[PDB]
Design a protein around this ligand. Structure first.
Ligand SMILES: CC(C)CCC[C@@H](C)[C@H]1CC[C@H]2[C@@H]3CC=C4C[C@@H](O)CC[C@]4(C)[C@H]3CC[C@]12C
Ligand SMILES: CC(C)CCC[C@@H](C)[C@H]1CC[C@H]2[C@@H]3CC=C4C[C@@H](O)CC[C@]4(C)[C@H]3CC[C@]12C
Ligand SMILES: CC(C)CCC[C@@H](C)[C@H]1CC[C@H]2[C@@H]3CC=C4C[C@@H](O)CC[C@]4(C)[C@H]3CC[C@]12C
Ligand SMILES: CC(C)CCC[C@@H](C)[C@H]1CC[C@H]2[C@@H]3CC=C4C[C@@H](O)CC[C@]4(C)[C@H]3CC[C@]12C
Ligand SMILES: CC(C)CCC[C@@H](C)[C@H]1CC[C@H]2[C@@H]3CC=C4C[C@@H](O)CC[C@]4(C)[C@H]3CC[C@]12C
Lengths: 160, 96, 132, 96, 145, 59, 48, 145
């Protein structure tokens, strides 16, 4: 009941996903409460934050998968810049939850946080390998070689 | 031998065509129960014999009986379809 | 009091007696029988159609309760009652004395299942027939 | 964990991060949020307290009833009652 | 038409019960299949525009490799390795990691997931066998009616 | 009807016989019988002590 | 019933009752959702 | 001659007990084998008079594909697809559904049915092991006699 945010109609994957994608068409009608208040209540629910985290990580996996399958250009591409911004944002979120929420011991105890550090580390090595010499063919092949390891980990972060 | 023969006769009589009928139900149940009891006695004495003197118990199981067609007890047991008697370690030791 | 409906006027004295047992028990505070009858959403004859004086004064007649129990079992349960056998013209029939006491027993049986009294239920179940 | 996580997803969490930094700057230099919450009324607290106390008493009565109906406990009670019965008979004979 | 049989009918009810374990196996495999497929297709063919053939290659080879058909001769041909040993004397040194990824992958799929599916089916069957027999006995009257 | 009624009575007699032969039920019956036995002894002593007061002290 | 006379018990389970809509006991049992009654050997023997 | 042995004899009795589970597996597979075989043979070879070779092809390839021998190179040759990717650049667009049907089929046969056979054998063995030992002990005297 705490997971779903004290609601009774949006209590499955499809219902919360459908309401999440179409906010103005399913939320007024399917009102449970066990307009503004309901909107403020649904999106603060923990389940809704999971579905936002799930969709975000799924797009990250699809976009990064497309980036590693498609050929690298002779300069840093637009999709590469988007992924750079995304992984800095991920790195800042990991550092904030380390330095300013639980503690360094509590963070490193979790196995998924260690996997998160490995992901961020793999992307930055591969990026800097490509970005050091963007027109070099050898730099592109090595960069894709490091980014192969980067994609398997993203698909395991779905196990979480 | 008499306990094995007794167990076989009561089990066959309890499912016979001559004991079917509404008034014979309790009687039928009683026969199955008694059959099981006689089976237990045949196994139990056999076990006691094997506990006391294994070689003499073996000699006992090989004995030919004048009352029936010179059949030993294992032949009787097979004819009585006593799975419990045949699976017993004393009987299996004599068969081996 | 006399009623214009011919089905409720055809009922025997003992049917009114079970109606009295339901009525006396129903007047108690927080009784589930009243809640069940109110939430049933049926008319005086128990039909699912959802004047007022007949619907409140004689809300616990046996025909309506039979309909409520029928809806509790399944969607096509329909218990058949025959009160015509309680008239004095059928007294010469030999086996009628068992029929008249079995049917009667059954409704009392149903009342005892409603109020959840297992011992009284078992006794009325034993008196009647169709045990299983 | 997902109660405390910001709503905004990962590519856009930077907005959430700068918003939290803005809140820290507003809190450390002229605080005006005050972290206001909601407090339950005394009527509903006393209702929860009454419910919990009543169910505590009900479980203890039910638990005591359950332990006295166990077989082991019943056999112990008959045993001490029988020993007390012989004791009562010994003092009775003495009087006799 | 097999639901009438006393052997085939309850088994059909249990097959419908195990379908959730089948779905669990599919969700866990999907993770390793798409991860390994994107990685392996990128290592085998760097420098190629994305097309429909890239997507087939990602779905195609990783799926059949879990049934024992290992396309190692075909992967040797695609990797442009000219050595007598299968993954030596290649044009790019990165493509020599393809058999390693593959090894991990089949360790994940055949050794770990398939045997866990066997374990889930044994547990699931022992749990719901009696309920399946009872449900078949109700369906015996339903089919007769 | 006769068959069903007869077998209903037979099952109820058999069921009652089966519940009174369970161990748990047997232990409960010995227990209430023992408590009633002490009660009977307490009223017996009372009669014994009453008889002692009534006769021995009267002489 | 099945212990005393199996054939008459079978005859009993097939009997149409006047009180309800001429439904036998197996139809009643299915309507009552009694899995225990339907899985019993006597009921299964009549269904077969 | 193995019935005399205390290890091999009871196992022989249980093998005869499991034969019903083997028959159950055969009846369930037969459904998927003939369904997939008719569909796959028709997709691979449209426009061909029915003959004995059509019937062999329906029985032949679907049966061995359940033992891990996947004739994907042979199906690529029969489909007349000339692309580097196995099921691209074909004459007919319908024949590209043959690997999909096949995927479903081996999911039905290897993943679902084989593991259910493992589950039925474990349950069947635990159920009839003691009865098999007792029956072997009666057969010990029968063989001696
Ligand atoms: C824990 C896991 C994720 C560690 C992953 C390590 C990866 C990113 C590193 C470790 C060693 C690296 C390899 C070391 C040397 C070479 C040879 C060079 O000519 C091409 C790149 C290649 C083939 C590298 C590719 C990337 C590589 C495989
Ligand atoms: C996953 C963690 C635990 C272990 C990772 C091991 C990885 C980094 C190792 C295992 C085998 C390694 C490969 C073995 C041999 C060669 C050939 C050489 O000419 C270039 C590097 C290359 C291609 C290696 C790259 C790194 C490699 C793939
Ligand atoms: C008991 C089990 C787990 C043993 C595991 C065996 C592992 C360590 C073996 C099996 C297959 C091997 C690979 C086979 C071929 C090649 C290509 C070569 O150019 C570099 C090494 C590399 C990539 C090997 C790395 C080590 C490897 C992955
Ligand atoms: C069984 C249900 C649940 C799903 C059915 C999926 C079917 C209809 C889908 C899955 C994969 C699909 C094929 C994928 C790609 C191609 C190539 C294209 O050039 C023609 C259509 C064709 C050949 C598709 C036909 C339809 C297809 C077979
Ligand atoms: C976890 C498991 C269930 C993943 C399932 C993978 C499925 C979706 C994959 C595996 C093999 C794939 C097929 C392989 C090749 C072809 C031929 C191509 O011309 C059209 C698509 C088609 C027909 C693919 C459709 C999708 C497919 C059936």
């Amino acid at each position: 009941a705490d997971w779903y945010g004290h609601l009774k109609s949006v209590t499955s994957f499809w219902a919360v996903l459908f309401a999440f994608f179409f906010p103005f068409f399913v939320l007024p009608f399917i009102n449970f409460s066990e307009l503004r208040r309901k909107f403020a209540k649904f999106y603060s629910a923990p389940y809704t934050r999971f579905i936002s985290d799930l969709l975000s990580h799924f797009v990250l996996c699809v976009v990064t998968s497309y980036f590693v399958l498609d050929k690298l250009e002779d300069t840093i591409s637009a999709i590469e810049w988007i992924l750079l911004v995304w992984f800095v944002a991920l790195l800042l979120e990991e550092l904030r939850q380390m330095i300013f929420c639980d503690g360094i011991a509590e963070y490193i105890s979790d196995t998924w946080n260690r996997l998160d550090l490995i992901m961020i580390t793999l992307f930055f090595v591969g990026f800097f390998t490509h970005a050091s010499d963007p027109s070099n063919q050898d730099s592109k092949v090595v960069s894709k070689g490091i980014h192969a390891f980067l994609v398997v980990v993203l698909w395991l972060r779905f196990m979480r | 031998i008499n306990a094995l023969v007794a167990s076989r006769i009561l089990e066959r009589l309890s499912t016979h065509r001559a004991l079917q009928g509404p008034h014979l139900a309790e009687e039928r149940a009683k026969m199955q129960h008694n059959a099981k009891k006689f089976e237990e006695l045949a196994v139990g004495v056999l076990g006691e014999c094997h506990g006391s003197d294994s070689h003499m118990a073996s000699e006992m199981l090989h004995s030919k009986n004048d009352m029936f067609n010179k059949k030993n007890a294992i032949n009787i047991a097979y004819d009585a379809k006593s799975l419990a008697f045949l699976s017993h370690p004393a009987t299996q030791s004599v068969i081996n | 009091a006399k009623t214009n409906i011919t089905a409720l006027d055809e009922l025997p004295s003992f049917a009114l007696a079970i109606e009295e047992l339901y009525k006396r028990e129903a007047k108690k505070p927080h009784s589930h029988v009243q809640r069940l009858v109110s939430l049933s959403n049926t008319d005086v004859l128990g039909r699912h159609y959802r004047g007022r004086d007949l619907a409140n004064t004689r809300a616990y007649n046996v025909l309506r309760m039979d309909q409520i129990f029928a809806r509790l079992v399944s969607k096509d349960f329909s218990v058949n009652r025959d009160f015509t056998i309680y008239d004095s013209k059928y007294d010469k029939v030999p086996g009628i004395q068992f029929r008249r006491t079995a049917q009667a027993s059954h409704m009392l049986f149903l009342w005892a299942i409603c109020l959840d009294r297992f011992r009284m239920a078992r006794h009325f179940w034993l008196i009647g027939d169709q045990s299983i | 964990e997902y109660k405390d996580r910001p709503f905004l997803p990962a590519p856009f969490i930077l907005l959430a991060h700068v918003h939290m930094l803005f809140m820290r700057l507003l809190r450390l230099c002229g605080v005006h949020t005050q972290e206001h919450e909601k407090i339950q009324d005394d009527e509903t607290k006393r209702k929860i307290t009454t419910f919990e106390e009543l169910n505590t008493d009900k479980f203890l009565r039910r638990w005591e009833r359950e332990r006295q109906e166990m077989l082991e406990a019943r056999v112990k009670m008959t045993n001490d009652n029988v020993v007390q019965a012989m004791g009562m008979m010994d003092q009775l004979l003495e009087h006799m | 038409y097999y639901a009438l049989s006393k052997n085939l009918g309850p088994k059909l009810i249990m097959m419908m019960e195990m379908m959730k374990d089948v779905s669990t196996f599919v969700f866990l495999l999907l993770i390793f299949l798409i991860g390994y497929g994107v990685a392996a297709q990128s290592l085998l063919s760097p420098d190629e525009d994305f097309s429909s053939r890239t997507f087939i290659g990602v779905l195609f080879r990783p799926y059949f490799q879990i049934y024992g058909e290992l396309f190692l001769d075909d992967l040797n041909s695609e990797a442009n390795c000219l050595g007598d040993t299968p993954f030596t004397e290649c044009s790019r040194e990165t493509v020599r990691m393809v058999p390693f990824f593959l090894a991990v992958y089949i360790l994940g799929s055949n050794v770990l997931l398939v045997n866990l599916l066997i374990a889930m089916f044994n547990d699931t069957y022992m749990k719901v066998q009696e309920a399946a027999e009872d449900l078949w006995r109700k369906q015996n009257y339903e089919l007769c009616a | 009807t006769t068959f069903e009624e007869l077998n209903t009575d037979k099952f109820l007699r058999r069921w009652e016989r089966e519940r009174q032969e369970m161990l748990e039920a047997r232990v409960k019956m010995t227990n209430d019988n023992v408590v009633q036995a002490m009660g009977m002894m307490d009223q017996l002593l009372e009669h014994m002590i009453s008889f002692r007061f009534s006769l021995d002290q009267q002489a």
